Symmetry: C5
Subunit: 205 residues, 5 copies
């Protein structure tokens, strides 16, 4: 207990928080989606509600330590407020995202961080043809709101969304769910922007 | 009031907060559910709303004291923000949980903590057959979001949910309610994962 | 303004906040309800919404002062966040209570505190028979969530709920509204538990 | 910018916040309503929703300064959290009031404060007869929750609610809107209770 | 990293926050709208819900630095709470605006600030004729709530709202969307007030 208290004090109370990446020191953020349920479909407003959990991973040199100096502690859990977290947001949401899980991250001695928020998201989708055999395709882009591809490099481990935790008695059946890295340009900035496109094909069970 | 002010100052202002359990220092958390009401059933979205209070108890050596050194004070009440609390959550919720009670915990001189938040939860459940004699079975898993079974040992005193405070004029009658501890070794890694599966069998009152 | 600034500084900046009552130093809290309106009745979920004022009164020796030492100031108003407040909650609510008034309390030189939050509460009630001449009876208990009768002694001035401020053009007419103090004993602990049962008999106007 | 930074520091960092009025030092608060729209009417719950802005004015000696000592600055804007604000509330609301504007106040060198929060309020009103030619009359009292007329003297500039900003394509048309000050006296206590009774007569367009 | 941590410390911890503009030191705020979707239309309450990005740009001398003194850092990202932000609000909203993006701003070495909050707004609009070929015209004014045209000079880059990110499968089709600067005079003091009128002509798809 004493060694962990000493580690947290040395990492967070001694030095200031990580101020975010720069062009000279970019950061790689790996995203992964686990789709739990398509809760609601609104044909009158063209909104679809998803329940999912987003796995986020990044590495910081400022969060590194030698386990031998801290009673062989290799990892710990801390409030997400105690550390820097990437500004990953849905680009086509219609309501503020609702958090369904505790905001706690796991820090490893090599500086690796894992943050897995469970969320409910309302996003822009026309559900016409959901009642058919062919179904309907919905798509939402996830990315850093303010950091370009020069500061935050977004990645996926696989393009396959995890559907092993998908609610078996859901109103909607998943036909396909993919997560793809895209490099986009905007009438904003000449720098490239990176997003992860979550594409879900579904129909009424 | 002076002895309690002195105790709170010695326990919270002198030392930093408990940083959570580790594999070398695991923590046992006892979980208990008291079901008060099945408020809403949504057949179009497959959501069911429960009102219940979740009893949580754990013991910390850092929260121990000698009552004789603090005017024979054996226990006290403090804001849940002043102490560490386990990250126990519903794994299949559809809305952020709503708190219906003050966020205050009871600390005993032996280091025991009791925190009983009253909550309204919307979770995933197909209520088809609720209008029948047989009823319908809903299930929701509770556990630590970030800690494994090597850090947090989640347990239940009984597998029976307390139904003594269940609303008598509820729209739904409950037929059975169990709280069972489950160990899931199947995930990735050699570490086990623990959860309390709250299983409720219910039907429309008649 | 200078004398009040000096008083608030001496009462709040000099000493830490009151840490709550103990068995050795209990606190009496007087509770009173002023029913303003029965806003909503939900026959499909068995929820009833009330708008009421909850008068709360307690006395603290730490909040006492001599008016002669502070320019003859006998009382003042302060944010409820600057002082300790009792954890009085509804035992059968279905939604987090909504606050409709500023969270400010009145402190008197004898240490008396007056806190009257205006609230909207959704609680468990079957409103079947509200459309009848006889009406329907709803009940909701109020009490400390974590303190027993040995730490917080809950009291009422009267058995009657103040209906003088009840909305005259409400959808529902009040036939009777009582607030009764109840002492309960549970098998698990020897301490008595106190609650105020708010019982309201009402029907659809005319 | 330097003179304003110096003024704010001298007014807020040097001295503690105004502790509120007393019987010996009473404060006059001038209240004014600008009705923007009657959004919703609920015949099943007897609730009416208004969108309006509430002009509040008071004067404090602690907020006075000599413009000549601060680069001829006669007034400034500050967050409402930096200053004391009166506890003016609706006495018959059914939902917590929703704030539609930034919580910023204007302070003048003579100690005058102007705070104009834009709000959405749900209050108790039977709207039976709104669909008729005669319309319906709704009333809602506003006043200090904890201060009596001996501490806060509530006033109005006019009896007329400002309707110059009322939404022209509203579902409901305003037939009359008064803003009248009332004194309530009791036999028990010598303390008067002051309120501003906002009375609105309206019908469906 | 070290140079950025040093820059943020020198800009925010050394000096107090920007206290806002004055008549003697006015500020130009550039406003731009990117309409993403007309989510909801409520014919019973006369409310229309929009999802848009509000680009805000201003320049402060207090936020200037020499990149050469800070490891050639030309820009950075910081929480909107760490800096002053203009009180730009919708004048005819019916609900508190909902934020759909992280509250982070970009600061450039010349003192330029870019803040782009993504929002969901419910505002006053009669949607009668939306089901027709001609459609319906909705308008909503945006401006500083407490600052006059003598303190905050509101500007636009173009008269045209960015519709390149408008949801293609929306329930409503955009016929025209303009953002125009207006100098209006209110019932208060003789100082002019500036706004940006967002006018949207739309119909059912
Ligand atoms: C402490 C002191 C005052 C108040 C308010 C005073 C103004 N009243 C509207 C009219 C009113 C009723 C009423 C009932 C008891 C005593 C004084 C009262 N004044 C609303 C309550 C609240 C808390």
């Amino acid at each position: 207990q004493a060694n962990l208290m000493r580690l947290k004090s040395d990492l967070f109370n001694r030095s200031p928080m990580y101020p975010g990446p720069t062009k000279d020191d970019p950061l790689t953020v790996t995203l992964g989606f686990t789709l739990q349920d398509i809760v609601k479909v609104d044909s009158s407003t063209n909104e679809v509600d998803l329940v999912y959990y987003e796995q986020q991973r990044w590495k910081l040199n400022s969060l590194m330590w030698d386990p031998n100096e801290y009673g062989n502690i290799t990892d710990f859990r801390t409030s997400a407020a105690d550390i820097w977290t990437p500004d990953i947001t849905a680009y086509s949401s219609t309501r503020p995202v609702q958090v369904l899980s505790p905001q706690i991250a796991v820090v490893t001695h090599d500086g690796s961080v894992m943050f897995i928020p469970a969320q409910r998201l309302s996003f822009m989708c026309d559900p016409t043809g959901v009642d058919s055999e062919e179904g309907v395709t919905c798509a939402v882009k996830f990315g850093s709101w303010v950091y370009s591809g020069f500061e935050i490099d977004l990645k996926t481990d696989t393009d396959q969304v995890d559907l092993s935790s998908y609610y078996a008695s859901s109103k909607y059946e998943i036909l396909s769910a993919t997560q793809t890295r895209q490099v986009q340009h905007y009438s904003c900035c000449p720098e490239p922007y990176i997003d992860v496109n979550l594409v879900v094909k579904f129909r009424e069970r």
